[PDB]
Design a protein around this ligand. Sequence first.
Ligand code: PHE
Ligand code: FE
Length: 268
Amino acid sequence: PDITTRKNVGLSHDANDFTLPQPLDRYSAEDHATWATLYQRQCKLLPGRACDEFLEGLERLEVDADRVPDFNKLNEKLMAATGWKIVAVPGLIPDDVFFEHLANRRFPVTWWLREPHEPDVFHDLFGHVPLLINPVFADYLEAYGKGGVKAKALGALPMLARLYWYTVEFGLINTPAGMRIYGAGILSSKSESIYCLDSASPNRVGFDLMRIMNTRYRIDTFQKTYFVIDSFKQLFDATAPDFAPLYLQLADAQPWGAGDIAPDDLVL
Ligand SMILES: N[C@@H](Cc1ccccc1)C(=O)O
Ligand SMILES: [Fe+3]
């Protein structure tokens, strides 16, 4: 039995949107201490690494440093800033429900936390949610959600997911102060936060819609390529055109491997 099944023994979910109210009972003191340790460790590590918008979202959303946050209390601030809410889910959900959530400004957050010794509540909430404070990033995510139906209609969801992976989960952003991180999967990771900026090993490549959507990724370890945007506005702009011809042109195409450099990459 996996972590999700194990964590969810005895609980339920809405039949339509796979949400539940956050099971606030069921958090044990060990959950709060684990949350606090993880939060603490990231907060000491992230200055001069996370983009400023991330660190600032933690503050403005008052993401508890010493316990798993109350989703509702967080939603009060999140709704007021950008019209988004978080919804508690049991873990991985059907993609149809996920896109529909994002299209509706609901951000699905796994309710449970890893054990001290899968996306969990730390990755989903610490990693993803602080950035929903940035209106352009907030709109990009909504646009992404809506983009689900066209990609589904075209059998191109894997191409859309690569885009999401390489921006929302593992995106880097170039600033006048140097490279910073906006990808949630990095930001909730001690070692990957270090690696993605410090190491000479991974490829660091200028964002390019078509290349990203034709690029495989790594699910069990650090990424081998990171894609770098100039701003949230550039990212929103570049992802505003009709994706339909892009999806069709890549239909019979062979994808770049997670570690490839493409002939026309802007490499760093
Ligand atoms: N422009 C995309 C929608 C989208 C926007 C932003 C992110 C992902 C997808 C389309 O034509 O389908
Ligand atoms: Fe994530």
